[PDB]
């Protein structure tokens, strides 16, 4: 069966509100569009949604909700979708999703560590092994012992229930795999994840990361570069494909959202200014200039340059951290010998006479 997997969108997310607010909604829709269009053209069988689908988990805008449900429909039009909402509890949204689950087969909100048996477009029997954030309060006392033991208990549970599968069994999780750059969070060991699953769809991480190949674990990441901390990222969904006879295979669907670029300067001066202006003028994406030695007073580039979203000041130590030999010497005579050796049929014949000329000039000088 064919699967379109998508990671947290951050619908209605306003970027850089501290410097220059930008409504990403337009861009975000365009990427979603391209993704959905690829899902249809590819005739996928199952669609997975994980991570932060809404940017604001405490107070989603009406429009943001409108967009979410909009794309949930477009999604269902192509194939059954399964949503695993994590750490999200607004206006009984989880309550919403639960209600729709019950009145439909084309959509299913999994919101409990208890497994659910969905059914794909082409009829494939998929068993979802869920592992969301946990409802209610564990408490401070139980987290050190209760918190890890409880998590372990859940995994032992998902394992047993995974073996009892029919066709395929997809694990879905909302957490942070232990060993990442770190970006309350839930840390989970890769070994703890069930091995018997055909695919483990994760989320809640902006940047795409293929954790492991067995069982195939993937973070699809966002569809737009939410901030400059990810200007070097490729954004898009992941199209996995599970088959019985053969191991899982997956492509990556490029969303192609506006690009970011950080311009680093030592100090903003007349030359710097011209450089910034010249660059931003021919750059479709968003720009952030960073500098060390102060060049203040500084002209209002933001007021002039409408696509200059942020101007920062990284220390020489930090600018080098985030930014992540011997030279051969050749005498003129040697280069000459080398040339007379490649650009002519016979070299040596010329070298013998040349060394005689060099000997004659050396002797007739001292």
């Amino acid at each position: 069966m064919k699967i379109l997997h998508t990671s947290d969108w951050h619908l209605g997310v306003t970027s850089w509100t501290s410097s220059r607010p930008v409504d990403r909604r337009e861009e975000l829709k365009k990427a979603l569009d391209k993704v959905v269009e690829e899902a249809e053209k590819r005739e996928v069988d199952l669609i997975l949604l994980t991570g932060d689908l809404l940017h604001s988990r405490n107070n989603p805008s009406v429009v943001a909700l409108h967009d979410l449900l909009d794309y949930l429909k477009r999604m269902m039009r192509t194939a059954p979708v399964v949503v695993l909402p994590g750490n999200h509890d607004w206006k009984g949204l989880k309550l919403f999703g639960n209600f729709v689950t019950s009145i439909s087969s084309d959509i299913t909100f999994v919101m409990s560590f208890e497994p659910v048996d969905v059914e794909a477009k082409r009829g494939q029997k998929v068993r979802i092994l869920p592992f969301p954030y946990p409802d209610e309060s564990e408490a401070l006392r139980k987290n050190e012992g209760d918190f890890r033991f409880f998590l372990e208990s859940r995994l032992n549970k998902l394992y047993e229930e995974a073996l009892k599968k029919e066709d395929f069994a997809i694990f879905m999780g909302h957490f942070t795999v232990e060993g990442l750059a770190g970006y309350r969070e839930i840390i989970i060991n890769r070994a703890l994840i069930p091995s018997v699953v055909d695919y483990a769809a994760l989320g809640h991480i902006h940047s795409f990361r293929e954790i492991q190949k067995q069982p195939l674990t993937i973070y699809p990441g966002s569809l737009i570069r939410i901030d400059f901390g990810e200007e070097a990222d490729e954004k898009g969904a992941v199209f996995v494909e599970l088959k019985r006879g053969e191991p899982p295979r997956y492509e990556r669907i490029d969303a192609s959202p506006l690009p970011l670029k950080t311009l680093y300067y030592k100090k903003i001066d007349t030359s710097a200014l011209k450089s910034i202006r010249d660059f931003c003028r021919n750059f479709p994406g968003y720009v952030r200039v960073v500098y060390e030695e102060d060049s203040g007073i500084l002209p209002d580039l933001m007021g002039e340059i409408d696509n200059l979203v942020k101007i920062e000041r990284k220390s020489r130590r930090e600018i080098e951290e985030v930014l992540r030999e011997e030279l051969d010497k050749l005498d003129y005579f040697e280069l000459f010998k080398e040339y007379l050796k490649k650009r002519e049929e016979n070299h040596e014949k010329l070298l013998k006479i040349l060394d005689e000329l060099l000997d004659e000039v050396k002797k007739s000088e001292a």
Binding site: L263, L323, K329
Partner: protein, 349 residues
């Protein structure tokens, strides 16, 4: 090399100076006409024995001291083993002495050369740098550096020509080769003569044609100097400025953030950093890696406000860890460099 120490006495422009080079940029300034320009001359003299200002060795004696000898010692690391050299020279005595004693881990100096002619041979044998090239490499005159930057392609290929090889030697090889051909053309044996003529004349043409080899040599400058220039512009500019050269447009293509830009547009401190970087790149592609550089202030009339700004922007050169000393003449440039060295009236104050 890495100059560690340089004790000069009665050397032209100097009376008695004791300098100890330290890591990072070094700046030396003093009353015009003394110490600044002469100090470096001394360091060039201590190694080979020719200097730059005068041909005859004896002319390098200070005017202020007559009938007196000029002594100068010099320690310098080069290859993981530091050496030491002390030459003395008296105009009156008509005698010049020297000695290339290497400093051991034990602290005891070992003999390598006695005569000044021997010390020269041994020094040139170290890092394969002849005095001819050394003069045009470790010493970077600001006037010529900045000029090389905004230079035309023809004047550029020229600069590259008279740095890897003496123009005189080329002309002399020229005339000698032309003379041999004249000899042949004028005169079994006849077949051997025709074979020699054609073969000697062809090689001649291969050397002579600026179209062919001279062009490839210029390529060596492009492929390698830029290659290294880019790295310098990265460690000093944080990946801001990248330099490439195109012959048709004229000069060296300069790009700021992927966007080309006239070099005249850059601020002084940028012209300096970029120019010096390309300069060290050329100097090193010709003489291998260098652990020291001498640059003297050019004091272009309209460059004064910049003098204080250029000083701040050039301070980045300290990040290279090379022993970089500036030979500035004006106080404004001299001030903003923590490590200063003033030489007044021949002595250091």
């Amino acid at each position: 090399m890495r100059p560690e120490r340089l004790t000069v006495r009665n050397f032209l422009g100097l009376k008695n100076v004791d300098i100890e080079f330290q890591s990072g940029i070094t700046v030396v300034e003093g009353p015009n006409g003394a110490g600044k320009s002469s100090l470096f001359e001394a360091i060039s003299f201590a190694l080979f024995g020719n200097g730059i200002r005068y041909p005859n060795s004896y002319d390098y004696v200070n005017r202020n001291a007559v009938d007196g000898t000029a002594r100068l010692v010099f320690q310098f690391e080069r290859g993981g083993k530091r050496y030491e050299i002390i030459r003395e020279i008296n105009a009156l005595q008509r005698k010049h002495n020297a000695k290339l004693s290497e400093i051991l881990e034990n602290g005891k100096k070992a003999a390598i050369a006695a005569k000044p002619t021997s010390v020269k041979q041994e020094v040139e044998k170290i890092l394969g740098i002849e005095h001819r090239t050394f003069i045009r490499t470790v010493f970077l005159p600001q006037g010529e550096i900045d000029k090389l930057l905004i230079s035309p392609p023809s004047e550029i290929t020229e600069i590259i020509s008279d740095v890897f090889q003496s123009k005189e030697t080329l002309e002399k090889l020229e005339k000698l080769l032309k003379e041999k051909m004249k000899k042949l053309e004028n005169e079994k044996k006849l077949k051997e003569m025709s074979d020699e003529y054609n073969n000697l004349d062809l090689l001649r043409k291969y050397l002579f044609d600026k179209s062919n080899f001279s062009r490839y040599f210029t390529g060596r400058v492009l492929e390698a100097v830029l290659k290294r220039t880019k790295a310098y512009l990265d460690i000093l500019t944080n990946g801001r400025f990248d330099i490439d050269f195109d012959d048709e447009k004229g000069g060296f293509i300069i790009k700021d953030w992927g966007i080309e830009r006239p070099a005249r547009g850059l601020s002084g401190g940028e012209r300096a950093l970029i120019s010096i970087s390309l300069a060290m790149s050329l100097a090193e592609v010709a003489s291998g890696r260098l652990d020291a550089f001498f640059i003297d202030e050019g004091f272009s009339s309209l460059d004064t406000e910049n003098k204080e700004k250029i000083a701040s922007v050039l301070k980045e050169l300290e990040r290279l860890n090379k022993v970089i000393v500036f030979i500035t003449h004006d106080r404004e440039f001299s001030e903003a460099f923590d490590r200063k060295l003033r030489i007044t009236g021949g002595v250091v104050v």
